[PDB]
């Protein structure tokens, strides 16, 4: 089975009233459903006795209540280990202090397991359902560490990693000195954190920072520690600041990974892609970095190795739009469609950005016959479009001279939450009313202009004074005339005076042609009366046209004389 | 002025389907017909109504005993009830000169028939029946009384008795519906041949819960085997043997055929009855057509439908009631 | 027992006793009559005594661009909500109690002389 293009994603309820009609509702409907699940879990865990009857065979461990409270109330080592597994930072500290004051022995492995808990969360309680630098200067972690009687390599490693995680870069480097003075050897994970601290500890020039890092790496070789993927990925992520200076140094890290045997992941290329994608002219370098990165990744299935693997596709598509290369965008999307690579697209924010830049590049550089195939396959099945892509789509129809599709884009726009977007309705009306068309098309444009008129009239900003742009009023009126709905056009002329919007020259000239056909002198004067209010120069010349073209009754002649008096 | 509660909701009334509605229902049926054909992997062009009904029964299996309540996807013509068209134009003038009778179609028909009877004067069964009132009420698209139906029929019969010509005969046949007469002639079993080449026929019979299957051989000495036993040993009751005799005796063929039959279920009498019916049906292959009609008229080829009636709750038996307690 | 509970419609049909030999022949008269009340009228889905605030049900889902978390009203903040619902309930009872008096006829208990308004508009857009 393949994706159903007429449907919204499977997570949503397949019902027209419950299906999301916009990108905003796409996000909020899922958050509302997740909120309901959390409320259920909150109740299940608060009142577990109601959910303890197990009638399932085989047993379902994942459908039973969870107990987050310690059941050992004795004061001993084996009771502390329980509070460490539950991640009770305060209870574990209190239990550790009391246990220490009593003078009982607490093992080293357990003392370390307490630091891993404090050093990770920063002596703060993890979030629960319901009841700057964050390395608190007064922190239980540092105290317990000092009081510690015997300290092994693992004790320092968890202290150094926790400081870097909480942005205590300077303290972590100072602690790395003691570890060396004490003839101890750190692990790869500790070195990864120290590389991040070397770059973020102080602001200096690249050459100074690039010399310390190479010293950490050589130290890592002296201590017989082998670098992992995160070691090289942290270097590239930290070199993002220096940009042009780090472009060639960054490529030296990648070539080293290949030789050593570490395999670059999606994150390794995301960091390189972001480093080279600096504001400027990308053609000089960014062109051949992305072309070579995709030939390498061509036909490769990816597995999760780094937390930043879900950012490559969003980064890669961003450059294809900048370069305006559609063949490269197809290769990037091709990589996303091989095997299970579609799961690396990222969160909803990254999924919508990827498809926005991807579709906006299709409308621009692709034939309109194929563009409408992607429009049907991607929207709304894959993502809900932003109002700026609907415009990029109309600009594509214009360039292709296929304007019979404009009424469809308006119907779709409403179904995607763009009914009351001003930039969009103005764009649609201007294209429809830009030039005259065969009678069949002109009639269709008047059915849409009517529906747009209704949107302007029934806006949800109706509480505020209705904003009727001048272009919208001129276009909607012109479309009625060219369609033969003259009655509707004449009625709208009042709205030019009510909202004080200047009438367009073209609209006034076409109104005369509708009058000379109906041979109505009063209406023709109503046109000259309107242009006279705004003091348009064409009016004085139009009054001459009205005289000759239409029979002027004595009352009408005096009315023109009254406007002539104004002249 | 003051307020009285409103009497009722107008929607609480019989609906009506406008011509435009049916026109759009047919566009949906034709698009859905192509969808259903695409679902089943069949050619949409050669997709018939029998295919639609079969596909709907598979995709939407319903066991409801009443077929009218089961899923259906039919052409709107079949589904929606036929609707009488407007009986006047924009100016309000009725189209038919008999509009104000309220039965213009019925009285226009009576008017046409009465006029034909007059012109004749100026000029001068087995396979067909008259249409029923419910069929006349559809040709006219109006509601009719029972006496309205009779008066129309009495007037058509008065038209047959006259010297009606060809023009006056096509008209009457519009109201004659052919009555199909079922053939009561007994179906003859095929004559088969065994390994030894002896001609025989085979049939079946049912009496109550007894079911019998009999093999009657064209030639024989009068031997009858019932479950491998001689009939007089299997049927020690003389009345059960008289039942076996009846088919052969009635056609004067005692001692001319051999029979081997198997019977299960029921009691001794019910089993003899089932064998009687099975032997008679098989024996019909070896007698003349006139003899088969005589066996039919003697009740020898009719399955007895008399079976035990269920007991009902609240009474002692199928019919007997509990004693009506003394008052 | 939870399984012995019925719907509101069942409970009112029984309590009101509008079908029965009492109401068939007006054998029972009603100076004091049980009056049907809709008890789901002013009730909000998600609102309970404990005063929990469920994001997306009874409070907004997102606040300041971030998803709200489960919260509970303070004991004082919940008393105000309960009191406000009682006052809103008495206000509704008083709005129904405030009904415009209609003028009487020839006498206070007589129908004669009372206006019934204009005749109803005929089917063909006729008005009186």
């Amino acid at each position: 089975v393949n994706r159903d293009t007429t449907a919204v994603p499977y997570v949503f309820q397949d019902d027209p009233y419950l299906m999301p009609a916009s990108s905003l509702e796409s996000r909020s409907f899922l958050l509302a459903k997740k909120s309901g699940e959390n409320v259920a879990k909150f109740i299940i865990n608060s009142y577990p006795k109601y959910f303890q009857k197990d009638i399932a065979e085989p047993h379902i461990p994942c459908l039973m209540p969870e107990y987050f409270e310690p059941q050992i109330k004795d004061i001993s080592e084996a009771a502390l280990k329980e509070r460490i597994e539950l991640r009770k930072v305060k209870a574990s500290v209190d239990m550790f202090d009391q246990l220490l004051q009593a003078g009982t022995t607490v093992s080293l492995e357990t003392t370390n397991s307490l630091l891993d808990l404090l050093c990770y969360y920063g002596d703060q309680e993890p979030s629960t359902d319901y009841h700057g630098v964050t390395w608190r200067a007064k922190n239980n972690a540092e105290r317990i560490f000092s009081l510690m009687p015997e300290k092994n390599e693992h004790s320092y490693c968890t202290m150094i990693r926790g400081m870097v995680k909480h942005r205590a870069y300077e303290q972590a480097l100072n602690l790395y000195t003691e570890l060396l003075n004490n003839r101890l050897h750190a692990d790869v994970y500790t070195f990864n954190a120290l590389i991040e601290a070397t770059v973020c500890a102080i602001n200096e020039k690249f050459e100074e920072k690039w010399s310390k890092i190479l010293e950490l790496l050589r130290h890592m070789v002296a201590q017989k520690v082998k670098p992992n993927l995160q070691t090289f990925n942290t270097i590239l992520k930290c070199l993002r600041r220096f940009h042009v200076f780090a472009r060639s140094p960054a490529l030296q890290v990648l070539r080293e990974m290949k030789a050593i045997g570490i395999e670059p992941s999606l994150a390794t290329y995301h960091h390189i892609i972001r480093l080279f994608d600096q504001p400027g002219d990308p053609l000089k370098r960014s062109s051949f970095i992305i072309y070579d990165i995709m030939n390498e990744l061509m036909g490769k299935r990816f597995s999760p190795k780094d937390p930043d693997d879900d950012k490559f596709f969003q980064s890669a598509m961003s450059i294809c739009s900048s370069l305006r290369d559609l063949e490269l965008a197809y290769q990037v999307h091709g990589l996303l469609k091989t095997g299970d690579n579609w799961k690396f697209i990222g969160p909803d924010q990254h999924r919508n950005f990827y498809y926005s830049k991807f579709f906006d590049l299709i409308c621009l550089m692709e034939q309109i016959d194929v563009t409408l195939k992607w429009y049907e396959d991607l929207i709304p099945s894959a993502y809900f479009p932003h109002s700026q892509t609907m415009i990029h789509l109309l600009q594509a129809l214009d360039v292709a001279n296929r304007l019979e599709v404009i009424p469809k884009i308006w119907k779709d726009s409403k179904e995607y939450g763009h009914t009351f977007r001003s930039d969009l309705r103005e764009e649609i009306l201007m294209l429809m009313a830009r030039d005259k068309h065969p009678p069949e098309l002109q009639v269709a444009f008047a059915d849409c202009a009517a529906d747009i008129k209704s949107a302007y009239e029934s806006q949800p900003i109706r509480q505020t004074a209705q904003d009727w742009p001048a272009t919208s009023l001129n276009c909607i009126a012109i479309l009625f005339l060219r369609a033969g709905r003259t009655q509707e056009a004449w009625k709208m002329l009042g709205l030019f005076r009510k909202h004080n919007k200047i009438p367009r020259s073209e609209l006034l000239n076409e109104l005369m042609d509708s009058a000379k056909v109906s041979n109505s002198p009063s209406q023709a004067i109503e046109v000259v009366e309107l242009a006279s209010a705004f003091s348009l120069p064409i009016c004085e010349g139009l009054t001459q046209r009205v005289m000759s073209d239409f029979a002027i009754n004595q009352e009408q002649k005096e009315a023109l004389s009254n406007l002539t008096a104004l002249t | 002025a003051f307020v009285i509660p409103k009497k009722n909701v107008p929607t609480s009334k019989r609906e009506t389907y406008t011509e435009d509605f049916i026109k759009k229902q047919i566009e949906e049926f034709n698009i859905g017909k192509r969808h259903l054909a695409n679902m089943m992997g069949e050619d949409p062009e050669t997709f018939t109504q029998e295919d639609i009904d079969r596909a709907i029964a598979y995709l939407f299996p319903s066991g409801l005993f009443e077929k009218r309540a089961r899923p259906v996807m039919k052409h709107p013509e079949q589904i929606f009830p036929r609707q009488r068209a407007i009986q006047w134009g924009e100016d309000g003038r009725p189209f038919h000169y008999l509009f104000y009778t309220g039965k213009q179609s019925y009285y226009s028909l009576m008017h046409d028939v009465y006029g034909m009877l007059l012109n004749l004067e100026k000029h001068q069964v087995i396979g067909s029946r008259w249409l029923i009132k419910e069929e006349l009420e559809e040709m006219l698209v109006e509601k009719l009384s029972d006496l309205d139906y009779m008066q129309f029929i009495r007037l058509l019969e008065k038209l047959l008795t006259s010297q009606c010509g060809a023009a006056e005969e096509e008209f009457v046949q519009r109201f004659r519906r052919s009555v199909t007469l079922e053939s009561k002639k007994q179906l003859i079993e095929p004559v088969q041949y065994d390994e030894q080449g002896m001609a025989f026929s085979k049939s079946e019979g049912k009496r109550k819960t007894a079911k019998a299957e009999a093999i009657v051989y064209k030639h024989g000495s009068g031997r009858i085997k019932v479950n491998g036993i001689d009939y007089q040993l299997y049927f020690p009751i003389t009345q059960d043997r008289e039942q076996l005799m009846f088919p052969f005796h009635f056609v004067d063929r005692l001692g001319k055929h051999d029979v081997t039959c198997t019977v299960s279920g029921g009691g001794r009498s019910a089993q003899a009855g089932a064998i009687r019916l099975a032997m008679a049906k098989a024996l019909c292959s070896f007698v003349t057509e006139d003899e088969v009609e005589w066996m039919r008229q003697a009740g020898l080829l009719t399955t007895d439908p008399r079976v035990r009636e269920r007991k009902k709750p609240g009474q002692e038996g199928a019919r007997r009631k509990f004693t009506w307690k003394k008052r | 027992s939870f399984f012995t509970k019925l719907t509101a419609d069942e409970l009112w049909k029984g309590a009101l006793a509008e079908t029965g030999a009492g109401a068939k022949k007006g054998r029972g008269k009603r100076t004091k009559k049980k009056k049907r009340k809709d008890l789901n009228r002013g009730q909000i889905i998600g609102e309970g005594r404990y005063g929990f605030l469920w994001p997306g049900l009874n409070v907004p889902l997102m606040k300041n661009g971030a998803v709200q978390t489960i919260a509970q009203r303070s004991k004082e903040e919940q008393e105000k909500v309960e009191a406000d619902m009682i006052q809103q309930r008495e206000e509704w009872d008083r709005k129904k109690k405030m009904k415009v008096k209609r003028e009487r006829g020839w006498s206070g208990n007589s129908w004669g002389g009372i206006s019934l308004g204009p005749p109803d508009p005929g089917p063909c857009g006729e008005t009186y």
Binding site: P20, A21, S22, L24, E25, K414, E415, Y416, G417, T419, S458, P460 | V3, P5 | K96, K99, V100, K101, R102, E103, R104, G108, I114
Partner: peptide, 16 residues
Amino acid sequence: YLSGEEVEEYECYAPD
């Protein structure tokens, strides 16, 4: 009766 008898639109996709 004399006491009184007082028993007493637009649609949008993705509304707000």
